[PDB]
C-alpha cells in the first residue's frame, strides 16, 4: 500500500450530516464525512461513465453494472476497495456540542393540560419559544459553538435553509392527559439541541483528501486504466459537485487549494488538469477549463474506452433513469457576495421566485420546467386542469410548444415515469449550481444541467438560454 495522491480542498458552507442530521452532535463533530466523498465519487463516476458512453456509443448503462464494471477499483460485495480515502480536516479537535444550561421552566408551566406546539426562532441573538397559542416567551440558554451573527443572518435570509428548519425547529406537545416536568424538561431540552446544532455552519472548511492505493490489485482487464478514469470522475466531482446536503443549490461547494501526487505514472494528467484551477483568473476562462477537462475525458485522450465487455447492461428507457453530463449546458459567471447568491438561488428554483417568473413567464411552462428539472416538486393533483396542462408540456408525444417530453410519459394513463417524475419524493435536481474559487478571491458561480435518460429530447439552446438568464439574475 502507498499514498496515491493528496487533494487539499475547501468546502463552502457545507451542510454535512450525521446520526442527528447535523454536522455536530453531543459526542463529536464532522464537517466532512469520508463516507460521503466515497459515495459521491461513485455517483460522479456512474455519471461521467455514462457521459463517455453517450458520446462514443449512443448507449446508456445501469448503475448496478457500471459499479460492477468498476468494482475492481471502488470495491463491492465481492472485492474490497482498491482505493481508500482518508480525510484529515484541519483543526483536528474534539469539539462536541455541549449545552451548559437552558433556563426554561415557565414555558413548561405554559404547557399544562393543553396540546400546543412549541416553535423556536432565533431573534437577535436570543431564542424564543413561540407557542403558537400566542406566547413568544424567551429562553436564557448557554452553550458552545458561538453562533456569530452571520449564520443567523445566512439561515434566516436563505429561503431554502429556513425551509429545512421547519423540521428541526418545532414539535407538538400533548398534555391534556397525564403530564410531567422532568419529562417535559427533557423533551424541550433536546428540541433546543436539535435546533442550535443546525447553526454549526461554517464557510471555508479546509480539509485534505488523501487517497491510497494497495499495489496488490493485479491488472485484471484495465486496472491501470479503470483507476485513472476514476481519478477523472473525482476531479469532475470536485469541479462540479460538493459535499454535504443541498449541493444541488451551491452549498458544500468544493474548491482546490493545492494538489500533490506521489505516482507520476498514473496521476500525471490528473494532477496537471487539477493544477489548472489554483489560479483561475476570468469567468469565461474557467468556462474553457470546464470544457477543457471534460473533452480530455471524451474523444481527446480516450482512456482505453473498453466498453466492449460483457459486464455492462443497456438500460430500459421506460423503466430506468440515468444522469450524464451534457457538455453544452455550462455557464461560469463571477460573484463577490457568496452569501447573496447562495440566498439568491431560491429566486431561480422556486415556482414563484423573481427569476423564472421572468424567464418562463407563465404558470405551466414554468412549473412543468421545474417538475422535469428542479428535482421533485410537491404538485398536488387535486385542483383543476393544472395537472394536465402541465402534463401537456411533459407528454411523450403531444402538442408541444416547448421541448420537455419524457420518454414514456403518456396522457390519459400513468406509465413508470409518469409516477416517478410526479410522485417520488427523492429525485435529484438536474439544474445545479456550484461556487468555486481559490487563491484569487474571484468567486465564479457555475450553473449546469445534468442530462437525464427519461428525456425524449431537449431543445439545447432554448433551455440553455433559459439557464443563461437564470445564472444572470442569480447575482
Amino acid at each position: 500500500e502507498e499514498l496515491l495522491m493528496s487533494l487539499k480542498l475547501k468546502a463552502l458552507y457545507p451542510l454535512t450530516g450525521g446520526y442527528n442530521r447535523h454536522s455536530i452532535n453531543p459526542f463529536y463533530e464532522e464537517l466532512v464525512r469520508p463516507t460521503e466523498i466515497k459515495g459521491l465519487w461513485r455517483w460522479w463516476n456512474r455519471v461521467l461513465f455514462n457521459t463517455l458512453a453517450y458520446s462514443t456509443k449512443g448507449k446508456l448503462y445501469t448503475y448496478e453494472s457500471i459499479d460492477r464494471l468498476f468494482e475492481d477499483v471502488f470495491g463491492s460485495e465481492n472485492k474490497k476497495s482498491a482505493v481508500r480515502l482518508e480525510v484529515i480536516t484541519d483543526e483536528g479537535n474534539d469539539n462536541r456540542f455541549e449545552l451548559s444550561y437552558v433556563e426554561l421552566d415557565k414555558v413548561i408551566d405554559c404547557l399544562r393540560n393543553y396540546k400546543r406546539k412549541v416553535s423556536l426562532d432565533f431573534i437577535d441573538n436570543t431564542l424564543i419559544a413561540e407557542i403558537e397559542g400566542s406566547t413568544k416567551i424567551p429562553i436564557s440558554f448557554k452553550s458552545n459553538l458561538d453562533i456569530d451573527k452571520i449564520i443567523k443572518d445566512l439561515v434566516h435570509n436563505n429561503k431554502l435553509l429556513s425551509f429545512e428548519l421547519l423540521g428541526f425547529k418545532s414539535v407538538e406537545i400533548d398534555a391534556t392527559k397525564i403530564s410531567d416536568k422532568k419529562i417535559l424538561k427533557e423533551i424541550l431540552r433536546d428540541l433546543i439541541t436539535n435546533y442550535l446544532e443546525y447553526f454549526n455552519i461554517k464557510q471555508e472548511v479546509t480539509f485534505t483528501l488523501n487517497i491510497y492505493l494497495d499495489k496488490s490489485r493485479e491488472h485484471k482487464q484495465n486496472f491501470e486504466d479503470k483507476l485513472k478514469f476514476a481519478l477523472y470522475s473525482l476531479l469532475v466531482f470536485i469541479l462540479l459537485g460538493g459535499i454535504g446536503r443541498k449541493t444541488s443549490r451551491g452549498f458544500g461547494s468544493l474548491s482546490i487549494i493545492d494538489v500533490k501526487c506521489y505516482d507520476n505514472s498514473i496521476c500525471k494528467k490528473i494532477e496537471d488538469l487539477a493544477k489548472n484551477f489554483l489560479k483561475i483568473s476570468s469567468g469565461n476562462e474557467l468556462k474553457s477549463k470546464i470544457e477543457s477537462i471534460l473533452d480530455c475525458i471524451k474523444n481527446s485522450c480516450i482512456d482505453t474506452l473498453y466498453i466492449e465487455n460483457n459486464i455492462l447492461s443497456e438500460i430500459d428507457p421506460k423503466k430506468n433513469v440515468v444522469y450524464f453530463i451534457n457538455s453544452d449546458l455550462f455557464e461560469v459567471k463571477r460573484i463577490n457576495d457568496k452569501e447573496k447568491v447562495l440566498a439568491n438561488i431560491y429566486k431561480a428554483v422556486s415556482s414563484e421566485g423573481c427569476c423564472i417568473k421572468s424567464i418562463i413567464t407563465d404558470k405551466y411552462v414554468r412549473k412543468s420546467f421545474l417538475i422535469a428539472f428542479g428535482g421533485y416538486r410537491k404538485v398536488e393533483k387535486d385542483k383543476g386542469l393544472d395537472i394536465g396542462f402541465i402534463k401537456n408540456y411533459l407528454c411523450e408525444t403531444c402538442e408541444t410548444v416547448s421541448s420537455f417530453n419524457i420518454v414514456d410519459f403518456l396522457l390519459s394513463e400513468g406509465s413508470f415515469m409518469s409516477d416517478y417524475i410526479l410522485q417520488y419524493e427523492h429525485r435529484n435536481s438536474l439544474l445545479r449550481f456550484k461556487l468555486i474559487s481559490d487563491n484569487s478571491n474571484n468567486s465564479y458561480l457555475i450553473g449546469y444541467i445534468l442530462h437525464s435518460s427519461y428525456f425524449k429530447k431537449i431543445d439545447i439552446k432554448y433551455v440553455r438560454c433559459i439557464l443563461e438568464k437564470l445564472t444572470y439574475c442569480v447575482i
Binding site: 442527528n20 459526542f27 466515497k38 461513485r42 481508500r84 410531567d180 422532568k182
Partner: protein, 284 residues
C-alpha cells in the same frame, strides 16, 4: 417480567458502567421491537421513565401508525445516545487484569510485548457480531463478562500475519505463525480498552442511496444508526512468545499495521489506530 423490561432503560442511566451492557441492550431490543405495543396504555411508569416522552410527543395526526414509526426512529437514536453517553469505560479492572496476566506469563517464562494502540477515528470492530444487532443492525465485538468492547486476538493475529506474509513472503510467515503442520510461534491476546478521553461508544450512521440500485429511479436513502468506538480510546493487548527469533518482525510490523485499517469499513477511514506504547519484557 414485563414489569422488568419497562424499567430496563432507567437501569442504564443509573449505573453507567455496572449493568451488563450485552444483556441490557438485548432486553431493550424487546421494547424497541414492540415499541408500538409498549405505548398503548402501559402506565405505572416512573418519573425517570423514558417512554412517557413518546406519549406526550406527537409527530403525525392522520395516521396512528405513521406516528409510531417516526417515534421508533427517534427511540433508536435516543437509545444509541443513552449507551454512548451513560456507559463509559472504567479501565481499572482491565489494568488489574493485564498486569495479573503479564505476571502469569512471566511465571511461564515467556517474553511479553505489551502494546497500547489508541483509536484515532471512530472504529468499528466486529461489525457483524451481536451487540445491538437486534436494534441497530450492526454490532461491536463485546466481551459480556469484562463488559467491554474488544478486538479479538484472532483478528490482530490475522491482520499482522497478512502484513508479514505480504512483506516478508510466505515461508517467513509460516515460520512465525505456522501452518497445518507446524504450530505458530506467537500468541496474541484480545485487546481491551484501558483509557478513553470522554466517551467509549459513539453513535453513527450509514445512509446508502445507490447500492444494488439499477438506476436513479430505485434510489432512496436507508439510514442505519449504529454504535462505533469513540476516538482517543486506548486498547491494550499482549503478544508473547518463546523464540527471540520472532521478536524482531513483530516489533517491526506493529507500528505500520495500525495506521492502516484495523477493523471494518476502513476503506472510508473509520478504524485507524495509533501505536501509543510498546513494552518488551524479555524472559531471562
Amino acid at each position: 417480567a414485563i414489569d422488568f423490561l419497562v424499567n430496563i432503560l432507567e437501569l442504564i442511566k443509573e449505573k453507567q458502567c455496572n449493568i451488563n451492557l450485552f444483556s441490557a441492550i438485548s432486553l431493550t431490543s424487546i421494547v424497541y421491537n414492540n415499541f408500538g405495543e409498549f405505548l398503548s396504555n402501559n402506565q405505572s411508569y416512573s418519573t425517570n421513565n423514558p417512554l412517557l416522552k413518546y406519549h406526550i410527543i406527537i409527530l403525525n395526526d392522520k395516521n396512528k401508525t405513521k406516528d409510531v414509526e417516526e417515534k421508533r426512529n427517534i427511540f433508536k437514536r435516543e437509545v444509541a445516545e443513552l449507551i454512548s453517553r451513560n456507559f463509559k469505560l472504567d479501565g481499572e479492572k482491565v489494568r488489574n487484569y493485564f498486569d495479573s496476566l503479564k505476571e502469569v506469563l512471566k511465571s511461564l517464562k515467556y517474553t511479553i510485548v505489551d502494546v497500547e494502540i489508541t483509536t484515532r477515528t471512530r472504529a468499528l470492530i466486529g461489525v457483524s457480531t451481536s451487540l445491538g444487532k437486534l436494534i441497530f443492525g450492526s454490532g461491536i465485538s463485546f466481551d459480556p463478562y469484562m463488559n467491554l468492547p474488544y478486538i479479538p486476538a484472532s483478528e490482530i493475529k490475522g491482520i499482522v500475519r497478512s502484513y508479514i506474509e505480504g512483506k516478508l513472503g510466505e515461508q517467513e510467515a509460516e515460520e512465525i505463525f505456522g501452518n497445518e503442520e507446524r504450530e505458530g510461534n506467537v500468541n496474541f491476546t484480545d485487546a481491551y480498552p484501558t483509557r478513553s478521553k470522554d466517551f467509549l461508544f459513539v453513535p453513527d450512521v450509514i445512509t446508502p442511496h445507490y447500492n444494488g440500485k439499477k438506476s436513479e429511479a430505485d434510489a432512496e436513502p436507508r439510514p442505519v444508526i449504529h454504535l462505533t468506538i469513540a476516538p482517543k480510546v486506548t486498547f491494550r493487548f499482549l503478544i508473547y512468545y518463546k523464540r527471540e527469533d520472532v521478536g524482531k518482525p513483530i516489533c517491526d510490523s506493529m507500528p505500520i499495521i495500525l495506521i492502516r485499517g484495523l477493523g471494518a469499513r476502513s476503506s472510508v477511514g473509520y478504524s485507524l489506530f495509533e501505536l501509543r506504547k510498546i513494552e518488551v519484557i524479555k524472559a531471562a
